[PDB]
Amino acid sequence: AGRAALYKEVYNVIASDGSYVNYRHMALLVDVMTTQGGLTSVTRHGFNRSNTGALMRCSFEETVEILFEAGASAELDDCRGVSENVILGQMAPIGTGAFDVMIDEESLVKYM
Amino acid sequence: STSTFQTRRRRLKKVEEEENAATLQLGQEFQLKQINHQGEEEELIALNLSEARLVIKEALVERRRAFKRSQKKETREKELESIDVLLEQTTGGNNKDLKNTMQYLTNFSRFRDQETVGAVIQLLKSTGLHPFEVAQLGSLACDTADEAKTLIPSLNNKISDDELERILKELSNLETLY
Amino acid sequence: VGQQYSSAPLRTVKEVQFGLFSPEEVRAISVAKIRFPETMDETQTRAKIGGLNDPRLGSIDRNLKCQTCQEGMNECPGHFGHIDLAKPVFHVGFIAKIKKVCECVCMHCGKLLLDEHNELMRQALAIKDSKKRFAAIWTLCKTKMVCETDVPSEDDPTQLVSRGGCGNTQPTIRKDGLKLVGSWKKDEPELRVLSTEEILNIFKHISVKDFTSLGFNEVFSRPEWMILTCLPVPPPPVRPSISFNESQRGEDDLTFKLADILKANISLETLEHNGAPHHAIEEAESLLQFHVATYMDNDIAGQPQALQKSGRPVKSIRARLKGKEGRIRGNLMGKRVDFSARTVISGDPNLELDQVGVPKSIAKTLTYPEVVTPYNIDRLTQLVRNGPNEHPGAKYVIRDSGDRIDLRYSKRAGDIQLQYGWKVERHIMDNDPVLFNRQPSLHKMSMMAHRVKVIPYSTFRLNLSVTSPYNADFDGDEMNLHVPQSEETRAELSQLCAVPLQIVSPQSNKPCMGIVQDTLCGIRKLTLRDTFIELDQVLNMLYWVPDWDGVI
Amino acid sequence: RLVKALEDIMVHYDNTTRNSLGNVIQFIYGEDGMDAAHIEKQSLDTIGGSDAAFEKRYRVDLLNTDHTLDPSLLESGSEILGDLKLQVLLDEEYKQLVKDRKFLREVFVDGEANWPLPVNIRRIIQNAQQTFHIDHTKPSDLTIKDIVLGVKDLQENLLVLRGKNEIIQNAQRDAVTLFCCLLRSRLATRRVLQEYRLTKQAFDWVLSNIEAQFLRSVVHPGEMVGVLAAQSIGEPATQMTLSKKVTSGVPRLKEILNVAKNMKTPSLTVY
Amino acid sequence: MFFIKDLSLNITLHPSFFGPRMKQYLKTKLLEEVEGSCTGKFGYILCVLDYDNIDIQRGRILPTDGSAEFNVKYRAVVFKPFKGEVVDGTVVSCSQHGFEVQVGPMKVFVTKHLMPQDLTFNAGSNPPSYQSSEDVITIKSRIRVKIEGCISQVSSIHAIGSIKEDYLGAI
Amino acid sequence: LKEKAIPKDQRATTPYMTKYERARILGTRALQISMNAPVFVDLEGETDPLRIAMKELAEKKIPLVIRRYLPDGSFEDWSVEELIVDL
Amino acid sequence: IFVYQNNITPSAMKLVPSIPPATIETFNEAALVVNITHHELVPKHIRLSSDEKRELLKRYRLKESQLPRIQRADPVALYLGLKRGEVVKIIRKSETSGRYASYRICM
Amino acid sequence: LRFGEMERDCMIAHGAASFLKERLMEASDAFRVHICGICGLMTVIAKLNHNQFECKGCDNKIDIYQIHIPYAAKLLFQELMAMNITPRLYTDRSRDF
DNA sequence: TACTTACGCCGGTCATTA
DNA sequence: GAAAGTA
RNA sequence: UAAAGACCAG
Ligand SMILES: [Mg+2]
Ligand SMILES: [Zn+2]
Ligand SMILES: [Zn+2]
Ligand SMILES: [Zn+2]
């Protein structure tokens, strides 16, 4: 029910203004604030304090303590996050990168 | 470099590479338990000379064959001749290694017939010794059980002197003449 | 990038394994000892003393030297060095943890304060979550202030079971600047400052299984490591100097703070080897901790900003990464880039929706590396001859042999016989897809791909209906343009972010571009029943429509 | 924050919407798997109106002289009157349409009948019509089965998820529930004949598009919906030129996103 | 000793070679890069086996440039030497410091001091020799050696061997 | 593991090629033709790689395979051929 | 299920996790005056057999951490007396699709 | 000009994966350091020339790779090191999943 | 129960400096 | 300067 | 070349 209100509410701030937002955007927000169990906030206190990798997290609010608390509890960032790859300068797993591209040698002869 | 079928996760502490000796302690990349191309345990493949003379020869030949399907659209002193040709027709030519190995192999092979070389194998194989030994025993001409157990220390308590003495006898026979 | 071939296999990074540096590693990895606090002058002679910055570390001078490595300035990354502190010191960042870890383990013996024997503890010890677990284990152990010898087993509370033992009451520790002070109690308290050596040692004795329980790691980060012993010296590339000609200084901020740490260090040691008026040596030790603490974080609670003679606070390393304008957020999440251009915009009712008029001046600067293919050898050769100053032209030829011919000087510019596989950096030409954008960029739409149309005059010309999306007027707004440099990059621009593609937006399931100003106010009138058009005109109005089937 | 908070969320190759941990944030993107840019505000007729009017529209009684498809509308008019087997399907239909009407009034308690859904079915038909030059004068040549069975069959093709197992399959039926009510709403035997004089050809066409069009509307695995939503909410917060008195606008959203405790206006409504 | 080891290389092909007979170009590259190679990890790579079935697998198209990256799995015949491996070969070089015996692709060196003493060096002879109460060792002479130690060097492996123990020496 | 390569049938993704897969195939393919890679169509006039690329895709003569990752690491392969190119 | 009127002693409520397997719940009368599950906003939940659950995870290739979580002390979680691990299936009406499947695992 | 944070978020929105990597790398930083296959450090004393590689301290010369990361990051790393923190970079994964 | 801590929207020119 | 999370 | 500051554009 919480999630129900949290949305009704966000929806009404954009409603008063007289603008429109397709339900999905507000929803995806509202659901994120909700999955973990309660009311994680879009705050240095809530969201950025999860399991997402060090490098990601450190690119918002507490940059250095996050990197320290990291080498100290020897975390491991697997790099599934956009930010991880941006920092590393590699193609992130986004749209054009959500998949790989293979040369099929077989079909490369069917054609000739 | 060329990655081999074993992925030991080297987490920082990279230090423990033991002494490589015929205590049968060979590299990690040479244990009894190997892992096959298709991911299945396969026991170490050790070759005694001559047997490796055939292996190489065979492939070097089979290769020359396919090399022409695409071009569509005996006697010691004599083989060092016949082989030196096959090489210059299926090898990089600069492979001084393969050339040398082929000569060495040809000049020191103890069995020249894929049949004889199979006998040797069957014979030895019943011992249960480790591939390294079964290979050495095969490529080192030994008379007394002592000469053997001395050049192949790994043995010593693995097979009786008489037993190993029998096998050594059987080998001197199969020992293709020249 | 990096340049010059390397036989080394090239892979991508898949995992970042964070951890702390063990003093024994630093020594290993180091390539220079570093004893002297000076920088150079082998007795005023300009070079570099085997003391600080390059006693074999990186380099300076566009002087290939660098312990064989050579390569020179660009290519040689840094080479770390070390500096054997004279006494163990904290690490500003971990003072909080060191404190809390002590409160969790008893001193003198070095063992947890709540075995599996205690219940509530067990609960915590089960908590899989390095961080939340240590979090709990503490709340339980901070309170426990005696290294019990025997605890009533999980049976009868009368017979007490044996565990480790050493009653030694545990001192309630507290923080004073960069020191941890504890007050024991037995029978008034007994106040004494816990030494680094002291705490470092307790830790060195904390059981491997006990780190772990307390969110640590046997291989990558044991508590004892939060106490610096051997200090890693970052190489020139990290703290480059500034050479104004020959006879002039230039040392970086960090290079000074190391010299300080090095000085304050030499000081101490030479005291423990001489008249050691003990409780006066400790006067000099606190100093070392001040710098080694300050060199990292220099915005601590106990104020003393550690100012550089000139009032300036001295950029702590931490300072360098703190968000916005700072490394992570200013140099990686976003950065200044090449192949970009910006200038005043102005509407033009004669450009198709998806084009963008580009001033020739700008088209002659931004280029695109096209590769000599039989498909274009001819064209490209034409552009090259054409030179870098005429428009339809180019300004750089690059042969396989990594080396670029500067078409505006190479004594052979008029010459040059291209070669398949070669690369010609040519001028932006009509239709090169480009990224056009106006800030603040809060829309996918604030950045869209356009077709280039080189035109005269100095303004970016853009179609009106595309106005809103960017949210631009022509009262002086400027807009920036980015030219994709690779064949697939453009493909990504043209196939995914072209203006036409962005017309109907998810933002609110409706089009985000319509007809405006003149055309709008005017389309109404044209429409009104009253409004009739007579032949002479109608004929023009018809001709203007570029598609018209030519059927009055 | 909205952005940094959702960066890593995108629709994966399985239609699930996960973050950079593989944690599910929505099982199917937007509760329907449809891409926002492919949706228009259509109206679910069934919802409103009097039970009376609803009947006069969707009801077809082949067993009643006064309530059958007049033989003018259909070509198999007279020979269908009184067919007990056809009136079995023709019922099944009306009993579903009514089911829907209930279900919609359940979902949209309000009665509000205009909601954005993929495939603009009205236009698809508008074209059908003056594409084939259909004259509201002649009789169609649709079997009562043609209509009923086609529509029933079409739905089998509006695929959002493609698992070959029961869990997924249920998921599939769910994600399509509302679209279908819309579909049956507009492809009811009475309508397809009395309203839009669709001919067998036209019908076979409309059906074909609705399908393609639908399929095109499904979201593409890749779509970084995270940032998209962040910006879609964030952007209009910038355009906010700021019982009635209650915190509102920017200051209010700031309240919400922060999940702040004490709020300026903490009212509560009792019915 | 001599083994048959299952290995694997990784070749990056330019897009130019995205021909109809690509597999053939890959296989040939493999051969250039492996046959004759030498590591300490695997030893001397000598002959790639079973040519006709060298597994090619699908290549990954590298993102920035258009090359494809292939992980070629082959199987070859290698020769890694060890301490205590008794092996016999032919002498090649011979000086006042000892003689160099050639075993396979490799070379084992015998130190005058790892030979029995009775066996002394003879400079005044040609080709230079080492003689004993009954033996005589020179360039051509076959010898059975005992490898005391190896030293992996760039593109090769060397070792030092003795013939002072029993059953070693000339044959 | 490759215990992760979901067998051909049992594949459950989309029959259709996503916008990115196509944007990315056309780009990659251009990038290769642009590099003197062998072309698989009659470049009837054509001289621009993206143009050529589009043509190849049109006659489904692009020898590439899209490897689609599922959040767990398992993956399904699809041929630029199989893939329905509505888009 | 023990329904107390005003409250129990921390002494008493400290003898609950004492008779395993059997479990014990405790509700305050005031908390039950109104059934919350009858609320406009509260969607119907559903416990899943450890089979129904193991399936769910198979058909979405999930681990447990990748599932939306419900709190042990969650009002409805109590109503159904959930347990750490038990998965609930929430079914709510959608303005986008009519019905929406949603799972929540327990904390 | 600055392709800043917000501009980055847009390319992400578009799903223009490559173009993003292009701005950040080819069109700005992009450096080529050599990593050690054991410790994820940037220690490799590579002398691309005499083909020698080495990593005394880990004692290597064999397990070594090269990578392409934005120089600004090469800095970030050497800096986390100066602060005694180790950002080990690894070419393959372990944790699986 | 009172004390401690992170943070802040997204290009251009001129002046001065231990 | 305001608001939220520890000794 | 690098800081810190003032002023100013949309
Ligand atoms: Mg303006
Ligand atoms: Zn160097
Ligand atoms: Zn103790
Ligand atoms: Zn190393």
CA distances from residue C202 to C22, C107, C286 in whole angstroms, order as listed: 16, 6, 21
β-bridge partners, E131: E120, E136
Alpha-carbon distance of B137 to B152, in angstroms, equals 8
**CB atoms inside a 10 Å sphere around CB B145:** 19
What chain H holds in terms of domains, given with CATH numbers, is 1-85 (3.90.1800.10)
DSSP string, chain D: -HHHHHTT-EE-TTS-EE-TT--EEESSGGGT-B-GGGEEEEE-GGGSS-HHHHHHHH---TT-GGGS--TTT-SS-TTTTT-TTHHHHHHHHHHHHHHHHHHHHHHTTT---EEEEES-HHHHHHHHHHHHT--TTS-----HHHHHHHHHHHGGG--S---SSHHHHHHHHHHHHHHHHHHHHHS-HHIIIIIS---HHHHHHHHHHHHHHHHHHBPPTT--HHHHHHHHHHGGGTS------S--SHHHHHHHHHT-SS-S-------
Alpha-carbon distance of E46 to D236, in angstroms, equals 69
Alpha-carbon distance of C295 to C92, in angstroms, equals 10
The reply to whether H39 sits in an annotated binding site is: yes
Amino acid at D20: S
Which letter, b or e, does each residue of B120-141 get, where b requires 16 or more Cβ atoms within 10 Å of its Cβ?
beebbeebebbbbbbbbbbbbe
Which residues, including other chains, have CB under 8 Å from residue H78's CB and lie 6 or more apart? C77, C78, C80, C234, C235, C237, C238, H42
Domain of residue G106 covers 35-107
Q: Which ligand is nearest to the CA of H34?
A: 4
Amino acid at C210: D
SS3 letters across F34-67: CCCCCCCCCCCCCCCHHHHHHHHHHCCCCCEEEE
Task: Please tell me whether any atom of strand J lies within 7 Å of the Cβ of A8.
Answer: no
The reply to whether H58 sits in an annotated binding site is: yes
For chain B, domain boundaries? 1-46, 47-71+75-178
Angle between helix axes B131-139 and B116-125 (nearest 10 degrees) is 140
**CB atoms inside a 10 Å sphere around CB D110:** 8
**Nucleic chain J contacts, protein chain A, residues 22-81, CB cut-off 7 A:** 41, 45
CA A110 to chain centre: 42
Which residues, including other chains, have CB under 8 Å from residue C522's CB and lie 6 or more apart? none
The reply to whether C102 sits in an annotated binding site is: no
Q: Which ligand is nearest to the CA of C58?
A: 2
**CB atoms inside a 10 Å sphere around CB E90:** 16
Alpha-carbon distance of C372 to C507, in angstroms, equals 42
DSSP string, D200-214: HHHHHHHHHHHHHHH
Copy the structure tokens of residue E16: 């130019």
Q: Is H17 on the interface with C (CB under 8 A)?
A: yes
Residue in the block written with tokens 């968000």 = C323
Number of helical H runs and strand E runs in chain C = 16, 21
Entry resolution (Å): 3.4
Q: What backbone torsions phi and psi does residue E74 show, to the nearest 5 degrees?
A: -120, -170
Cβ pair B12:C220 closer than 8 A: yes
**Nucleic chain K contacts, protein chain C, residues 212-251, CB cut-off 7 A:** 242, 244
Residue in the block written with tokens 């002197």 = B161
Residue in the block written with tokens 């919609």 = D104
Alpha-carbon distance of H78 to C47, in angstroms, equals 24
Q: What backbone torsions phi and psi does residue C550 show, to the nearest 5 degrees?
A: 60, 50
Burial of residue G17, with CB atoms counted within 10 A of its CB: 0-12 exposed, 13-18 middle, 19 or more buried: exposed
Copy the structure tokens of residue E94: 């011979």
β-bridge partners, C161: C151
- Tell me how far the alpha carbon of residue C73 lies from the centroid of ligand 2, in angstroms: 8
Which residues, including other chains, have CB under 8 Å from residue D88's CB and lie 6 or more apart? none
Alpha-carbon distance of D224 to D7, in angstroms, equals 8
DSSP string, E34-89: HTT-B-SSS-EEEEE--GGG-B--PEEE-SSS--EEEEEEEEEEEE---BT-EEEE
CA distances from residue B43 to B48, D49, D113 in whole angstroms, order as listed: 16, 81, 73
Task: Using alpha carbons only, give the angle C142, C143, C148 rounded to the nearest 5 degrees.
Answer: 100
**Do residues D77 and D139 lie in contact, with contact meaning Cβ atoms separated by under 8 Å?**
yes
β-strand C150-152 against E44-48: which pairing, if any? unpaired
Three-state DSSP class for residue C51:
coil
**CA of D224 vs chain H CAs: smallest distance (Å):** 6
Residue in the block written with tokens 């493609």 = D162
Residue in the block written with tokens 């070594």 = H64
- Which residues of chain D lie closer than 8 angstroms to C504, CB-CB? 37
Which residues, including other chains, have CB under 8 Å from residue E55's CB and lie 6 or more apart? B37, E72, E73, E74
Q: Which ligand is nearest to the CA of C165?
A: 3
Task: Find the residue in G nearest to D166 (Cα).
Answer: G59
SS3 letters across chain G: CEEECCCCCCCCHHHCCCCCCCCCCEEEHHHHCCCHHHCCCCCECCECCHHHHHHHHHCCCCCCCCCCEECCCCHHHHHCCCCCCCEEEEEEEECCCEEEEEEEEEC
CA H49 to chain centre: 21
Q: Which of C239, C240, B10 is nearest to H65 (CA)?
A: B10
Q: Is A86 on the interface with H (CB under 8 A)?
A: yes
For F1-87, CATH number out of 3.90.470.20, 2.60.40.680, 3.50.80.10, 3.90.940.10 equals 3.90.940.10
Instruction: Report the greatest alpha carbon distance in chain H.
Output: 46
**CB atoms inside a 10 Å sphere around CB B32:** 12
CA distances from residue G84 to A37, B165, C99, C131, G60 in whole angstroms, order as listed: 13, 70, 34, 21, 20
Q: What backbone torsions phi and psi does residue A27 show, to the nearest 5 degrees?
A: -55, -55
**Do residues B168 and B142 lie in contact, with contact meaning Cβ atoms separated by under 8 Å?**
yes
CA distances from residue E126 to E102, E130, E137 in whole angstroms, order as listed: 20, 11, 12
Which letter, b or e, does each residue of C146-156 get, where b requires 16 or more Cβ atoms within 10 Å of its Cβ?
ebbeebeeeee
Nearest nucleotide, CA C173 to C1': J7
Copy the structure tokens of residue D26: 């929505």
SS3 letters across C316-337: CHHHHHCCCCCHHHHHHCCEEC
D touches which chains (3+ CB pairs under 8 A)?
Answer: A, C, F, G, H
**Do residues C509 and D116 lie in contact, with contact meaning Cβ atoms separated by under 8 Å?**
yes
For chain F, domain boundaries? 1-87
Chain J nucleotides close to protein (CB under 7 A) are: 3-5, 7
Three-state DSSP class for residue C448:
strand
Which residues, including other chains, have CB under 8 Å from residue E80's CB and lie 6 or more apart? B26, B27, B30, E1, E3, E42, E43, E44, E157
Copy the structure tokens of residue B173: 């026979």
- Tell me how far the alpha carbon of residue C341 lies from the centroid of ligand 1, in angstroms: 19
**CB atoms inside a 10 Å sphere around CB E144:** 20
Q: What backbone torsions phi and psi does residue G95 show, to the nearest 5 degrees?
A: -85, 0
Helix (H) or strand (E) holding H66, with range, is strand H64-69
Task: Using alpha carbons only, give the angle G59, G62, G64 rounded to the nearest 5 degrees.
Answer: 130
- Which residues of chain H lie closer than 8 angstroms to E64, CB-CB? 18, 21, 26
**Cis amide prior to E15 (ω within 30 degrees):** no
SS3 letters across chain B: CCCCCCCCCCCCCCCCCCCCECCCECCHHHCCEEECCCCCEEECCECCCCHHHHHHHHHHHHHHHHHHHCCCCCCHHHHHHHHHHHHCCCCCCCCHHHHHHHHHHHHHCCCCCCCHHHHHHHHHHCCCCCHHHHHHHHHCCCCCHHHHHHHCCCCCCCCCHHHHHHHHHHHHHHCCCC
β-bridge partners, E69: E12, E60
Cβ pair E60:A91 closer than 8 A: no
Copy the structure tokens of residue G26: 């405790």
Sign of CA dihedral A43, A46, A52, A54: positive
Amino acid at C221: S
Alpha-carbon distance of C305 to C316, in angstroms, equals 10
DSSP string, E124-143: TSSS-EEE-SS-EEETT-EE
Three-state DSSP class for residue C471:
coil
Cβ pair B12:C219 closer than 8 A: yes
Task: Find the residue in D nearest to G53 (Cα).
Answer: D167
Q: Which of B6, B1, B56 is nearest to B36 (CA)?
A: B6
Copy the structure tokens of residue D36: 């926002």
Contact between chain G and chain D (3 or more Cβ pairs less than 8 Å apart): yes
Task: Find the residue in C nearest to D227 (Cα).
Answer: C444
Number of residues assigned to chain D? 271
Alpha-carbon distance of G49 to C175, in angstroms, equals 53
**Do residues A88 and A53 lie in contact, with contact meaning Cβ atoms separated by under 8 Å?**
no
The reply to whether H10 sits in an annotated binding site is: no
Alpha-carbon distance of H82 to C98, in angstroms, equals 20
CA H79 to chain centre: 13
Task: Please tell me whether any atom of strand I lies within 7 Å of the Cβ of A69.
Answer: no
DSSP string, A68-104: HHHHHTT-EE---SHHHHHHHTS--SSGGGSEEEEE-
DSSP string, C221-253: B-GGGGSEEE--B--GGGS-----SSS-----H
- Which residues of chain H lie closer than 8 angstroms to C365, CB-CB? none
- Angstrom distance, A45 CA to J4 C1': 9
β-strand C228-230 against C447-455: which pairing, if any? unpaired
Number of residues assigned to chain E? 171
Alpha-carbon distance of F41 to F38, in angstroms, equals 9
Residue in the block written with tokens 């058909």 = G59
Q: Which fold has domain E83-171?
A: OB fold (Dihydrolipoamide Acetyltransferase, E2P) (2.40.50)
**Do residues H73 and C9 lie in contact, with contact meaning Cβ atoms separated by under 8 Å?**
no
Burial of residue D6, with CB atoms counted within 10 A of its CB: 0-12 exposed, 13-18 middle, 19 or more buried: buried
Three-state DSSP class for residue A65:
helix
β-bridge partners, C146: C169
E to F CB pairs, distance under 8 Å: 27
Alpha-carbon distance of A7 to A18, in angstroms, equals 16
Residue in the block written with tokens 């040398």 = B100
For chain E, domain boundaries? 1-82, 83-171
Number of residues assigned to chain H? 97
The class (CATH top level) of B47-71+75-178 is: mainly alpha
β-strand G98-106 against G69-70: which pairing, if any? parallel
Three-state DSSP class for residue C89:
strand
Q: Which fold has domain E1-82?
A: Dna Ligase; domain 1 (3.30.1490)
CA distances from residue F53 to A111, C435, D72, F43, G74 in whole angstroms, order as listed: 15, 22, 55, 10, 57
Residues with CB under 5 Å of ion ligand 4 are: H 36, 39, 43, 55, 58
Residue in the block written with tokens 């697939």 = C488
Instruction: Tabulate helix, strand, coil % of chain H (nearest 5).
Output: 30, 25, 45
G touches which chains (3+ CB pairs under 8 A)?
Answer: A, D, F
